[PDB]
Structure 1
Amino acid sequence: MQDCGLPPDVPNAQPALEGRTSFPEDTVITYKCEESFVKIPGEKDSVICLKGSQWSDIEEFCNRSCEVPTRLNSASLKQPYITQNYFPVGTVVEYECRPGYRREPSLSPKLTCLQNLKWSTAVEFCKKKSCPNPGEIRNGQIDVPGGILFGATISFSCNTGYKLFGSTSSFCLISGSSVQWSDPLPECREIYCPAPPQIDNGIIQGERDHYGYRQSVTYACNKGFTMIGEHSIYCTVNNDEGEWSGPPPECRGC
């Protein structure tokens, strides 16, 4: 009769019958691979109802493959693997470094689909690029807690008596073709105490324009006046603010 019966049973595949058990001549039935199965590229996935109520032949066209290789931050799959989804056991794909990573020549940038349907063990075939030597801050310091490779953070400080002007930290971030420091080296600026206080009936010996950390100012009483107190005071520096060590002496008469 001008109709075929049920199409052939294909291992690991299911046909789309659309609710019927009888099919007219020239009917084309397509099979879909079952769960955990991927169709083999370049193979038929359908049958056709021919004359004599006979279906055309069809061979197993499904496998048995690894999942799409897991997403790496250091490397991306090369072409053509990057567009593929069929990875039977034994399949080896190749990677290439992303930015800002570079190849570790001693290591293979390849992964193999194993018998258990899993990709081989991942090694660091693509490593983190390094940022330039951070250098130095005059009268300050640079803290490098964990190297200077891509993704690293460094911090800046100014020594006692100096004030930081600029950025307090920097990060090694990807910059176009390479990796560079997010921020430039800041500046450590000398902290000045307020102008030293004058005293009644006394003077400052050779008063300077500016007083920095630990610098001192010496007092002297005018003729006929007696000194009572510290002959000199010095500049203390805390939390980036200058402040004299204590009050200036007194010059009492007479």
Structure 2
Amino acid sequence: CEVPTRLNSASLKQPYITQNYFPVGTVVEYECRPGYRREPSLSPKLTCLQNLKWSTAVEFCKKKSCPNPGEIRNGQIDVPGGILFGATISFSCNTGYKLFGSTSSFCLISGSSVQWSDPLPEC
């Protein structure tokens, strides 16, 4: 068997990444990459088949959700791409009120979870 399949949500655990030899009947295990929660229904394991190919791999992790952006006073928030890990919400004010602060707020990974690093502007 060759190097295990690469996924966009999961990465090989510590013993598997170092290992370079995979005989027939070998099970490797994945883990969620930063910013990705794990779907309970799917099991993150791959066996090596007799044709020296790995078993079908499906994404074993899903993107995390940043908290609700809240309600700004005297203005609106676009929320164009949703609130998943890596989003970007925009802020604006009504006619006669000047925006003070940041204009956007990316959903980034702050510690063990995802947070919006930018604070809310006042206008």
TM class, shorter-length = 0.7 to 0.9
Aligned length: 123
The secondary structure found in structure 2 opposite 1:165 is coil
Gaps of 5+ in 2: none
Bigger proportion of residues as strand? 1
Relative to 1, partners in 2 of residues 1:116 and 1:165: Cα closer, same or farther, differing over 3 Å?
A: farther
Relative to 1, partners in 2 of residues 1:78 and 1:139: Cα closer, same or farther, differing over 3 Å?
A: same
Q: Deviations over 1:72-101 (max 9, x none)?
A: 342221232222111233322111112221
Relative to 1, partners in 2 of residues 1:90 and 1:171: Cα closer, same or farther, differing over 3 Å?
A: same
Distance apart, 1:146 and its partner CA: 1.9
Relative to 1, partners in 2 of residues 1:159 and 1:83: Cα closer, same or farther, differing over 3 Å?
A: same
CA contact (8 A) 2:90 2:103 kept: yes
Report the aligned-residue RMSD: 6.7
Larger radius of gyration: 1
Output the CA distance in 2 between the equivalents of 1:81 and 1:132.
34
Output the CA distance in 2 between the equivalents of 1:159 and 1:119.
57
Relative to 1, partners in 2 of residues 1:138 and 1:104: Cα closer, same or farther, differing over 3 Å?
A: same
Output the CA distance in 1 between the equivalents of 2:55 and 2:93.
49
2:119 matched to 1:184?
Answer: yes
Output the CA distance in 2 between the equivalents of 1:150 and 1:68.
28
Q: Deviations over 1:205-238 (max 9, x none)?
A: xxxxxxxxxxxxxxxxxxxxxxxxxxxxxxxxxx
Relative to 1, partners in 2 of residues 1:120 and 1:143: Cα closer, same or farther, differing over 3 Å?
A: farther
| Percent identical residues | 100
TM-score of the aligned structures, taking structure 1 as reference length = 0.43
2:117 matched to 1:117?
Answer: no
Relative to 1, partners in 2 of residues 1:118 and 1:182: Cα closer, same or farther, differing over 3 Å?
A: farther
Distance apart, 1:140 and its partner CA: 1.0
